[PDB]
Design a protein around this nucleic acid. Structure first.
Ligand SMILES: [Mg+2]
Lengths: 55, 119, 63, 62, 62, 76, 126, 189
RNA sequence: CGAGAGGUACUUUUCUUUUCUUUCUUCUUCGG
C-alpha cells in the first residue's frame, strides 16, 4: 500500500491506482487487457466532435 | 592402409537391348560426367588444406574418382556435390580467368623454379 | 526419493501424441516395472554386426 | 496416427524459421524480447503467438 | 453477407455463441483460451458487486 | 575409536541441544563467559573451545559401538 | 608520460547505422604503422562517421608531472581502463569498464605495456 | 523457488517449536544458511527472480546508458562493497562530469578475491571486476556454471546478503529506468 | 458426530545460436 506522493505521476498530475508487474503478460498470454485500457483511455480523454467514436 | 576395391552394384535388365538404350547411354554420358573436376578439386584441396591427402575432403574425392572411372563400365554417375568446389585456383595452373591465389605448397615452388630458369 | 518425487510433480501430465506418452507416465512405467506380467508385448531391440560396414551402404542393406 | 506424428515434427522444425522473424522486425527495446532473452518469463514462442501467428494447434486425443 | 448472395441464412451476431458471462468480456478472442475460462466461470461468481435493491426481505447467510 | 575422526553435524546439533538444555536448567558453565546470556552462545563457545565433558557412544550396525570424546573430535 | 601516439582513420562500423541506441565497434587502420584497432565508441554521444581521421594517445597518468595515482585537457574522449590480456603480431586487450579494445599491431611498437595495469585512453578528432 | 509457490492467494503454514532441543537443531540443519546446495543436482538452491534477472540483464546488455556520480552514490547505499574508479573521464567535448558504465555497477556485488569465467557469453571477471560481456544469457540464470554457484563455491559464508543487496540495487536501478509493456511491443513493427 | 455439494490450490515449467546452401556454363590424369 504505497502513498500517493511516492507513485510515478503523469504530467497532468494523474497518479496510477493499481500497479501490476509486466512479467504476468508473456506467461499468461493475455492481450486485450491493454487494448481495453487503450480503448477506455481514448473514451475518457477529451478531444481538442465526440460522435462516431469507437465505444 | 589401402582403400576399397569393389565398385557399385551392376544394373541388369529383365529384357534384351533394343538398340535404343545404347543411344540413351551415349547421350546421357555427356551429362552427369564430372570426371574432369575430381582430379582438379583434389589437387587444389591438397594445396589449400594442411594434412593433405588424409583429410575427409580428400577421401570423398578419392572415392568419387574411383566411382567416376567406372562410369564407362557400369551405369553409376559420380554426382560431384556442392560445397566441395574450391572456387580459387593455385599458382601452378593455366586458369588465368579464375580469381587465383599464390600457392604456398611444393607445387608453387616447382612452378616458380621454372620461371627462375626461363628468365 | 525426494529428488525423484520433485521431478515427478513438476512433469508434463499430458501426452505428446497418440504413439508416445506423457513424461509422467514414462517415469511411472520405468519406476513401476516389476509387475512381472501385462499386455504380452515383450519388445526387443536387435543390433548390427561390425563386419557389415565393409560394403557400400552395408548397414542399410543388412537392416 | 502415424501420418500426423510425422507431420507435427515436420511442422515444428519448419516453424523455427517462422519464429525467427521476431528478431528482424522487433526492436531491441521490446519488453517481450528483453524478458525472453533474459530468461525471466516467457520465450519467443509466446511472442510469435502474441504478434504474428498462433501456429500449430493439435491434440493428442482421438 | 453483402457481396455473395449464396447463403440464404445469416446470424444476428457472432458474439452470441457464448454464455451471458462470456459474451460480456471485452476482447475475448484476443486472450488465451485458458484465461477466459477462469474469468467467465470462477472470477465472475466471486467478484463482489451488486447484491440486491431490497436488503430487508433477504436474510441470506452471507 | 577408529571410525571417522570428525564430528558430524547430526551429532553436533544434538550435543549443542543437550548443552543448551543443561545451561537453561541453571548449570555451571565450564567456559568463562564475557557478557552473554543466551545458552546457545555459551554452548557454541564450549564446543569450539573443547571444554565439555560429553562422550559419544557411536553405535555400529553389527551390534558393537565405539565410545568417542568431544575433545578427541574436531569441528570445522 | 605518453607511451603511444598515432593518427588513426576508421574503415568500418559494426552496426553501421545512425540511431541504433547501442555501442559501435569501430575498425580503424592506422597510417605509417600498419596497426589494426577495435574500439566500442558511443556514437549517439560522440559521433564518428566513416572516413574521418582522429589522433589517439594512451598514457598511464593524466597530470603529466609524475604522481602515479594541470591535467591533460587537450582531448575530448578521455577514458580509463585496464589491460588484462597481452596474449599475442602482438595484440592488446583493454576493457574500459565494459567497453573492449583490441590494439593489434607490430610487436616492437607495443612493448612497454605491463600486465594488469591501469591506463587511460585519450582521443581527439583533429 | 524452494517453496515452489507464488503470491497468488497461496497460503503458507508454519510450525513454532516449543522445546530448546528442537530449537537448537532447527537453525543448524533446516535453516536457509544450511540449505544452500540444491540436493537434486548439486547446484545452488536460490537464484535470481524475474525483476532482478531482467534488471541484471538490462544493466549489462545496454552499455550506453551511463550513470553520473549522484546516481552511483545513491545506488552504492545498497551495495556491500566500495566504489570503483569511474572509467569514463570524458565521453563528450561538453561533458563536465565523469560518468559510470553499466557493467561497473553490477561489479560492486563481487568480492575482491572473486574470479569468474564463462566462455559461452565471454564473461571474464578478474579481481572483483566484470571486465567483458557480449550478448549472452544463462550465466545469471540457474545452470552448471552460473556466478551464484561459483560464489557459493568461493566462500559460502556471505552470499545471502550479496543476493539481498543485488535484489535491492537492481530494483532501485530498474525503478530509475522503468520497465513497461505497451502496444508497440505487441505490434512488433 | 458422520454423508452430499460448491470453492482456494500445478504458473510457461523447456523453443533453440536469430548468422545453415545458389556468384552461375566450364580443362580428367598418363604412354605410343
Ligand atoms: Mg498461485
Amino acid at each position: 500500500l504505497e502513498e500517493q506522493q511516492n507513485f510515478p505521476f503523469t504530467i497532468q498530475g494523474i497518479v496510477p491506482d493499481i500497479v501490476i508487474n509486466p512479467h504476468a503478460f508473456p506467461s499468461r498470454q493475455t492481450p486485450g487487457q491493454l487494448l481495453e485500457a487503450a480503448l477506455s483511455k481514448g473514451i475518457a480523454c477529451p478531444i481538442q466532435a465526440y460522435t462516431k467514436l469507437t465505444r | 592402409p589401402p582403400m576399397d576395391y569393389a565398385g557399385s552394384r551392376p544394373r541388369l535388365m529383365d529384357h534384351d537391348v533394343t538398340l535404343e538404350e545404347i543411344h540413351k547411354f551415349f547421350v546421357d554420358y555427356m551429362i552427369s560426367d564430372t570426371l574432369g573436376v575430381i582430379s582438379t578439386a583434389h589437387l587444389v584441396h591438397a594445396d589449400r588444406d594442411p594434412e593433405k591427402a588424409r583429410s575427409q575432403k580428400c577421401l570423398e574425392l578419392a572415392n568419387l574418382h574411383s566411382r567416376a572411372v567406372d562410369f564407362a563400365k557400369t551405369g553409376a554417375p559420380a554426382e560431384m556435390p556442392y560445397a566441395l568446389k574450391p572456387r580459387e585456383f593455385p599458382d601452378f595452373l593455366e586458369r588465368f580467368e579464375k580469381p587465383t591465389y599464390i600457392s604456398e605448397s611444393v607445387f608453387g615452388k616447382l612452378y616458380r623454379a621454372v620461371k627462375s630458369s626461363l628468365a | 526419493a525426494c529428488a525423484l518425487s520433485e521431478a515427478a510433480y513438476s512433469a508434463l501430465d499430458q501426452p505428446i501424441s497418440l504413439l508416445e506418452t506423457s513424461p509422467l507416465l514414462n517415469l511411472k512405467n520405468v519406476l513401476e516395472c516389476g509387475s512381472k506380467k501385462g499386455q504380452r508385448e515383450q519388445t526387443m531391440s536387435l543390433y548390427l554386426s561390425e563386419y557389415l560396414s565393409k560394403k557400400k551402404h552395408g548397414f542399410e542393406y543388412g537392416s | 496416427a502415424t501420418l500426423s506424428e510425422l507431420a507435427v515434427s515436420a511442422f515444428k522444425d519448419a516453424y523455427r524459421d517462422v519464429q525467427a522473424l521476431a528478431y528482424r522486425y522487433g526492436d531491441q527495446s521490446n519488453s517481450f524480447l528483453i524478458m525472453s532473452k533474459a530468461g525471466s518469463k516467457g520465450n519467443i514462442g509466446k511472442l510469435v503467438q502474441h504478434s504474428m501467428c498462433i501456429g500449430l494447434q493439435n491434440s493428442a486425443v482421438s | 453477407l453483402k457481396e455473395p448472395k449464396i447463403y440464404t441464412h445469416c446470424e444476428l451476431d457472432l458474439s452470441f455463441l457464448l454464455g451471458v458471462s462470456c459474451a460480456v468480456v471485452p476482447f475475448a478472442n484476443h486472450d488465451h483460451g485458458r484465461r477466459v475460462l477462469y474469468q467467465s466461470q470462477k472470477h465472475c461468481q466471486q467478484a463482489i458487486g451488486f447484491s440486491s435493491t431490497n436488503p430487508n426481505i433477504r436474510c441470506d447467510t452471507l | 575409536r577408529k571410525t571417522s575422526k570428525f564430528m558430524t553435524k547430526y551429532e553436533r546439533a544434538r550435543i549443542l541441544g543437550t548443552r543448551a538444555l543443561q545451561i537453561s536448567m541453571n548449570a555451571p558453565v565450564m567456559v568463562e563467559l564475557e557478557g552473554e546470556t543466551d545458552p546457545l552462545e555459551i554452548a557454541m563457545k564450549e564446543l569450539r573451545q573443547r571444554k565439555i565433558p560429553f562422550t559419544i557412544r557411536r553405535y555400529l550396525p553389527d551390534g558393537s559401538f565405539e565410545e568417542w570424546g568431544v575433545d578427541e573430535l574436531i569441528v570445522e | 608520460i605518453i607511451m603511444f601516439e598515432d593518427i588513426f582513420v576508421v574503415d568500418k562500423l559494426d552496426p553501421d547505422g545512425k540511431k541504433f541506441d547501442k555501442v559501435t565497434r569501430v575498425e580503424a587502420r592506422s597510417h605509417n604503422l600498419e596497426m589494426f584497432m577495435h574500439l566500442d565508441v558511443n556514437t549517439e554521444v560522440y559521433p564518428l562517421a566513416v572516413g574521418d581521421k582522429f589522433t589517439l594517445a594512451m598514457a598511464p597518468t593524466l597530470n603529466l608531472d609524475g604522481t602515479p595515482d594541470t591535467l591533460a585537457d587537450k582531448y575530448e574522449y578521455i577514458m580509463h581502463g585496464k589491460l588484462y590480456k597481452i596474449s599475442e603480431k602482438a595484440e592488446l586487450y583493454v576493457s574500459f569498464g565494459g567497453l573492449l579494445m583490441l590494439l593489434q599491431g607490430d610487436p616492437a611498437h607495443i612493448s612497454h605495456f605491463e600486465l594488469d595495469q591501469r591506463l587511460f585512453l585519450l582521443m581527439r578528432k583533429l | 523457488l524452494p517453496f515452489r509457490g507464488d503470491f497468488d492467494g497461496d497460503c503458507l503454514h508454519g510450525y513454532v517449536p516449543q522445546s530448546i532441543q528442537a530449537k537448537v537443531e532447527l537453525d543448524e540443519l533446516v535453516a536457509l544458511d544450511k540449505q544452500l546446495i540444491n540436493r537434486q543436482n548439486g547446484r545452488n538452491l536460490l537464484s535470481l527472480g524475474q525483476d532482478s534477472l531482467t534488471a541484471a540483464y538490462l544493466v549489462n546488455v545496454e552499455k550506453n546508458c551511463y550513470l553520473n556520480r549522484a546516481q552511483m552514490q545513491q545506488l552504492q547505499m545498497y551495495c556491500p562493497f566500495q566504489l570503483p574508479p569511474p572509467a569514463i573521464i570524458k565521453a563528450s567535448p561538453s561533458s563536465t562530469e565523469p560518468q559510470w558504465t553499466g557493467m561497473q555497477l553490477f561489479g560492486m556485488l563481487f568480492p575482491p578475491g572473486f574470479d569468474y569465467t564463462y566462455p559461452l557469453n565471454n564473461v571474464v571477471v578478474s579481481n572483483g571486476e566484470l571486465l567483458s560481456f557480449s550478448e549472452g544469457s544463462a550465466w545469471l540464470r540457474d545452470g552448471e556454471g552460473n556466478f551464484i554457484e561459483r560464489l557459493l563455491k568461493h566462500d559460502k559464508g556471505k552470499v545471502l546478503d550479496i543476493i539481498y543487496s543485488a535484489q535491492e540495487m537492481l530494483s532501485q536501478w530498474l525503478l530509475m529506468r522503468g520497465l513497461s509493456v505497451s502496444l508497440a511491443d505487441l505490434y512488433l513493427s
